[PDB]
Design an enzyme around this catalytic site. Sequence first.
Site, PDB file in Angstrom:
ATOM      1  CE1 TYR A 172      -4.073  -1.679  -0.613  1.00 12.86           C
ATOM      2  CE2 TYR A 172      -3.261  -3.194   1.081  1.00 12.86           C
ATOM      3  CZ  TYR A 172      -4.160  -2.888   0.059  1.00 12.86           C
ATOM      4  OH  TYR A 172      -5.153  -3.775  -0.294  1.00 12.86           O
ATOM      5  CG  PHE A 191     -11.341  -0.858   9.251  1.00 12.05           C
ATOM      6  CD1 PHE A 191     -11.186  -0.560   7.903  1.00 12.05           C
ATOM      7  CD2 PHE A 191     -10.674  -0.085  10.186  1.00 12.05           C
ATOM      8  CE1 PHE A 191     -10.365   0.480   7.502  1.00 12.05           C
ATOM      9  CE2 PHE A 191      -9.865   0.958   9.792  1.00 12.05           C
ATOM     10  CZ  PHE A 191      -9.706   1.244   8.448  1.00 12.05           C
TER      11      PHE A 191
END
Lengths: 396, 396, 396, 396
Positions: free
Chosen positions: A120, A396
């Site tokens: 990322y 999450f």
Amino acid sequence: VTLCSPTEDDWPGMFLLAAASFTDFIGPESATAWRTLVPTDGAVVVRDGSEVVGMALYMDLRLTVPGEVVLPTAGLSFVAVAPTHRRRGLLRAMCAELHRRIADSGYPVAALHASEGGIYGRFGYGPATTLHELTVDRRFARFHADAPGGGLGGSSVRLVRPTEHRGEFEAIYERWRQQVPGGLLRPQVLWDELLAEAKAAPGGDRESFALLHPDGYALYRVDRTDLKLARVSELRAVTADAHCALWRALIGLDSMERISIITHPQDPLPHLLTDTRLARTTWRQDGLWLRIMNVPAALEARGYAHEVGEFSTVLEVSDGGRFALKIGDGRARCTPTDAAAEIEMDRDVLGSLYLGAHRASTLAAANRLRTKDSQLLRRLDAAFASDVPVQTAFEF
Amino acid sequence: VTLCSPTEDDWPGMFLLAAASFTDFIGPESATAWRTLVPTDGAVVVRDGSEVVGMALYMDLRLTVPGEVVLPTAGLSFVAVAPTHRRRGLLRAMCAELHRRIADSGYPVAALHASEGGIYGRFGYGPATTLHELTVDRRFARFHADAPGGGLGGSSVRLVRPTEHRGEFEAIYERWRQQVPGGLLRPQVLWDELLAEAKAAPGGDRESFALLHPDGYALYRVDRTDLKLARVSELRAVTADAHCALWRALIGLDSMERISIITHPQDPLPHLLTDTRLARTTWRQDGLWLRIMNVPAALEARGYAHEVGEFSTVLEVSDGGRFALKIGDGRARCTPTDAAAEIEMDRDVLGSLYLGAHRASTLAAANRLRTKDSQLLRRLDAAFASDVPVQTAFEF
Amino acid sequence: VTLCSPTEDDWPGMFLLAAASFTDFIGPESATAWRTLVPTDGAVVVRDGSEVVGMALYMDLRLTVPGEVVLPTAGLSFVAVAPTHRRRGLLRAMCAELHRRIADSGYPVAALHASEGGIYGRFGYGPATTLHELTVDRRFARFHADAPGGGLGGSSVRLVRPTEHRGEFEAIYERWRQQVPGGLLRPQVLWDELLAEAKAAPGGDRESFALLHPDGYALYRVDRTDLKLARVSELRAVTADAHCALWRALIGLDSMERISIITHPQDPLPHLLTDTRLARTTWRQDGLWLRIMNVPAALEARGYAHEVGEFSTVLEVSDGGRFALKIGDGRARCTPTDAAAEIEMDRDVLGSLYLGAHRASTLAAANRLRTKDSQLLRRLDAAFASDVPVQTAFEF
Amino acid sequence: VTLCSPTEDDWPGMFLLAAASFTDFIGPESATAWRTLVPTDGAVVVRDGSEVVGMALYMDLRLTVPGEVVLPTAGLSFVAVAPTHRRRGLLRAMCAELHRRIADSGYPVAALHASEGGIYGRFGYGPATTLHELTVDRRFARFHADAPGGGLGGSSVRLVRPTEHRGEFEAIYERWRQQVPGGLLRPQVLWDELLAEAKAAPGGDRESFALLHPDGYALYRVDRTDLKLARVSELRAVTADAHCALWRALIGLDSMERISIITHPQDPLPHLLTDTRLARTTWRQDGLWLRIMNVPAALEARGYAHEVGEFSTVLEVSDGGRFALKIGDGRARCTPTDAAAEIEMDRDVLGSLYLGAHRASTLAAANRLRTKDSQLLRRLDAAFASDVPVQTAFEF
Ligand SMILES: COc1cccc(N(C)S(=O)(=O)c2ccc3[nH]c(=O)c(=O)[nH]c3c2)c1
Ligand SMILES: COc1cccc(N(C)S(=O)(=O)c2ccc3[nH]c(=O)c(=O)[nH]c3c2)c1
Ligand SMILES: COc1cccc(N(C)S(=O)(=O)c2ccc3[nH]c(=O)c(=O)[nH]c3c2)c1
Ligand SMILES: COc1cccc(N(C)S(=O)(=O)c2ccc3[nH]c(=O)c(=O)[nH]c3c2)c1
Ligand SMILES: [Cl-]
Ligand SMILES: [Cl-]
Ligand SMILES: [Cl-]
Ligand SMILES: [Cl-]
Ligand SMILES: [Cl-]
Ligand SMILES: [Cl-]
Ligand SMILES: [Cl-]
Ligand SMILES: [Cl-]
Ligand SMILES: [Cl-]
Ligand SMILES: [Cl-]
Ligand SMILES: [Cl-]
Ligand SMILES: [Cl-]
């Protein structure tokens, strides 16, 4: 092979991809509940041609940043590419589209939890919180004379069943999340999951118990295979007294040899004991990752350290603009400029600085941010530091 | 059963106790060489009646503290009580006598490395540096585009035999130790030991090699049992370029799966790589422990952060006096007072704050330092922070 | 392929077989010293045809049995058959010849230590002592209020170098071996080996230390790989006070997590502690094996329990004769008879009963000794029991 | 914070404490069934103020002691203190109250199974039976020629489903428990649990099978993770023939590499095999603990060894009275006296002697019982020894 927002008929295929991609997949019922956190047009799918071979979405979150400021935050999740369609540019195409949508929607930051650490950074996300596992050999643990709540009388902590005190955990957590950088509002469907996970499962986890204080709680369970290890799944304390009281109770788990918890690097636990070494750091990893979507909105929204005196500089983010950055009285002003840059960094690096978990000096030593002025470094260091230690709310 | 300075005839008995107490005992020849670091009256022994059943000494050291200030430092070591004489007050008696001598000699600080973490806090020592083991899976390691020294041409690093470049390691280290808090002058008999340990030993360690740069060196060896692990015993870099260059060479150890090093929490290595997660923290422990012997001399000698504005407070150390502490322009003034204390802490806590490795806020959250003013906490935090990251020089 | 007493020229070939057969082979120099314990005609070899393919010998030993009676004992050892000559009857032929010689020489018993447990029962040897490894987690160990030697003043135990106190270990051991069933006289060449093994070896064992009391000693060393484990190689205590004092010192080994020792099932150590469970039995095995060569000489030489009242019975040993056995006033009379047997057992079973380590009832429950009278069983049990617990002296 | 007998409304809170304290908690339904074994006023709870923070109870049991005498026995169990209320004297207060009630009710002995070994000695309990785990490498196991039931014809043992032969297990066990010291009557609700545990559980234990003989049974199951290990949960044999027959069948488990069982130190199994070493002792621990509540009632109720001749002595128990103890013809008479004590011991030590599992000599060597007469020791040893080996019935 094209990219679009999923229709209702795409979701079964997404759940298939999810089940095949995520070993901790919460399952179709729970995933269907979490869809309530995904805004309209918050999801994209790649279909082959027919079936779904790529997916990604974001959820509407609220992130606390230093200064107790709460930012609308796009939480990237549910990201998967089919094993049949690797190296085809599908992730890059999905991330680009969602980032377009997130920016256009007015989110100043995006965030995620990373499955691997090498993916990322190229998309502008920097790791911004640090997970720190402590393992306590509680058989040797003795509290320091200075530690709160050691005297005569009763305990303030109660051993309770998690399901019977949901309201109180919610209230304590809500208080915690608003005052801690890294805090996230936990919506009701996530409280549903959490209490569902508190139950024993046939061939799975053992039953969870809770330790409840007016200003704190801990959820814990005995490990399924190591029956002398208690794993604290969550400990949220709004005061120091609550934190110490909860740890006195946990160390009172006399059946256990070891108590483990995923916490943060500044957890005061080790200093509560006469032997600080007994709180062993057994694991360290990046937690929340941050992509600053709008540099001036993010930098101006944040509180800064009052200790550092007013200063002004010019910051360039590699493909995110150049700004006159003035920081004083705990606030920043961040305006466009074409003046010569005094500080340069990639966008991900700014994400890593933003909550105060990494120091500008450290990143500079790696050449991840360039400046020719070491006084400016010291000033950035001090300014971006967080008064309240940075923590990780939930995955999450 | 009495306590005194050892005579020449006591040393064989001390070496016996040493051999029986320390599994890494360097042996009688080497120990006899290290005696040159022990000043006259720097040692005490407890004899039974006859034989030596307790011992302790200090060595004359030079410790760098923030502001690049070098302090004479009493290094406690060679501390042992016979297994036949436990729980007899021998350690407390030995430490009290040496502390008396150290204070009277004019040392502002004492220091040690702790065998266990629960022993030395009661004698005023606080852990002041933090050891951080990183283990790199080098097979996946790729340097970031931003990392220094990636371009065309040659390398600045040479693979060499340690014994043939002693002069250069000494010069590099001497530079390193003067600019880093935690730095210790390494005397010649310690350079003798280090290069002796660089040799292969029958049934022991494998041969060490060195990577040498003008501004840095690394000493490493393959692990004796895990032949795919290289252990870096020491890496000293005076510039960021040297540090990155050395790590490029270490990651070029293509025979190895893993490179491990005992470093500090702010080592920039993880940020040199595209996947910061590959630099795994596999172990964390207290390093140097500090006992502040003279509070005002220690506090005034140290440099403080220029970023924090002038402030004044009253600090009480639990049995170490109360002082008006004024900090401004990176310097402190510390004078006697009977004014009401605004900050209270045990002596060991001050040791832990002194080099900047632990934050006052963190210690406050454990109630190891008491103040009723959170602004004062923030100010202490900022003031005592170290610009240059705190490191551990060598064990003694 | 024939069998005879070795000549001087056979010994190099025996040492080759020994080196190839025994991973703990003491080596040619030491083995040559141990030859001084082998009487003339105490050894046999099998040559092929040329080279030695089988060997066995016995040493002249002195074994203490219940009643503090010392018996001349043939110690079988150095038994090996070449891997090229298995299943050829060589062991059976060697054992038969040595047993012939041992019986004709007038030894009432033979003894050995078994490499495997399934080999020597068919040749009349029964396991007669029991090795019991205790591992103490000394970090939790606290002595009971009742335990000897807990009060004020000094210790009676000294930490010493083994080589400097040989005379004292010899005297203590000599006292121990004469009062304990299982005791063996340890000749000088075995004291030579023991102190040689006390030294550190390059790539081998660490240095041994000793704890010395007027009435007891312990030899111990840190384990070569597990540096938190101290292995007690030998602990010989002539009084209970010496035993407790030595264990207080061993538990004072504060560097260690664990102390291990090979002892006997009746070692009082666990009862010295507040938590008897901390003395964990981590291993159990047969020690000394016994072949009774002359049933009446062996049975008459032994002392028996005075508590049991006079009784008379008829014992048959399967190929060792039938005897009228009268036991009273702690002595037995054992004379030939053709009267009906009341008790029957194989020769090996009698060996197992002889020192008091196994109960007749237990062996009866396995049908290893047959009688139709349970009162007779109870009487044998009581009579053959040893007042002083049975111990294992040293391996040979 | 007060102490009383629980009302019906306290039980849910007790089950919560139980679930949190005992990782093997049988659960609320089963626990509710076991309440039928708890007499009126057999339980105490400590409430905070509101919730239950401490609990303890006893069950009405029947314990066989040497001489096949069955004693009413108070079985302490369900003992827990909340982790929030440690070091508050709650256990000591609960034990004192139950002991008061148990004594006043007329129980001569109390008993328990200990979670840790350092807790119950101070309350007068001594460990009285010994658990001995044997692990057999059955691939090498061959029965001795002498072993019962080796000849031609059929087997007497049947492989059966446990649930279909409950009546027969009950009858065999009832016979076993009446003839073995340590035997406990097993009530119907415990037979309910046992057969419930015989069933496979999703993600839990595998299905149990039984080997049934007219005079013995074994319950066994394959280990859940080690599929080459069969764990014998229970083996009850009333004759030696039954015991050997059952072990022949178990060793006939040709799919398995290893058979493990928790048995006692005198199990004759090792002697059934040609290689006694194959029955490896892999674990050793205290089993049943005993607190003698009434010294003269307990000592007079027990049978003693007939072999030892009549003798008389004076025994003092540290806070349990002094008695003239006369032992002859297998019976004891135990009457009050103020004559000088010849033997002294703490109450727990007497518990450890009572079933014959520990020898007075061994305890004397630890100084846990004091006498100045070694003949008296030998006599106590012999008198208190048990003809039938001491065993552990079931955990409670
Ligand atoms: C709409 O449903 C949603 C929306 C958002 C999240 C989730 N989950 C919690 S998940 O499906 O179980 C889930 C999602 C992503 C993952 N990514 C990983 O890299 C990984 O390891 N596990 C993962 C598990 C469900
Ligand atoms: C005058 O001789 C000196 C003076 C100072 C130091 C040393 N050593 C380096 S040492 O003897 O090997 C040594 C000394 C103390 C130790 N303490 C420990 O807790 C431990 O684990 N190892 C130890 C090893 C020799
Ligand atoms: C005349 O020389 C003698 C005479 C008697 C004994 C010895 N030894 C101590 S030995 O050679 O090292 C030796 C001998 C036999 C062994 N048997 C084993 O089954 C085993 O495992 N090790 C063994 C080691 C040397
Ligand atoms: C009235 O209900 C009763 C009464 C008596 C016993 C039991 N159990 C069998 S229990 O609750 O599962 C149980 C009880 C005590 C324990 N103690 C321990 O130290 C431990 O480890 N496990 C334990 C398990 C239920
Ligand atoms: Cl928030
Ligand atoms: Cl802030
Ligand atoms: Cl956290
Ligand atoms: Cl220095
Ligand atoms: Cl500074
Ligand atoms: Cl370092
Ligand atoms: Cl002898
Ligand atoms: Cl005897
Ligand atoms: Cl022994
Ligand atoms: Cl019974
Ligand atoms: Cl009896
Ligand atoms: Cl049993």
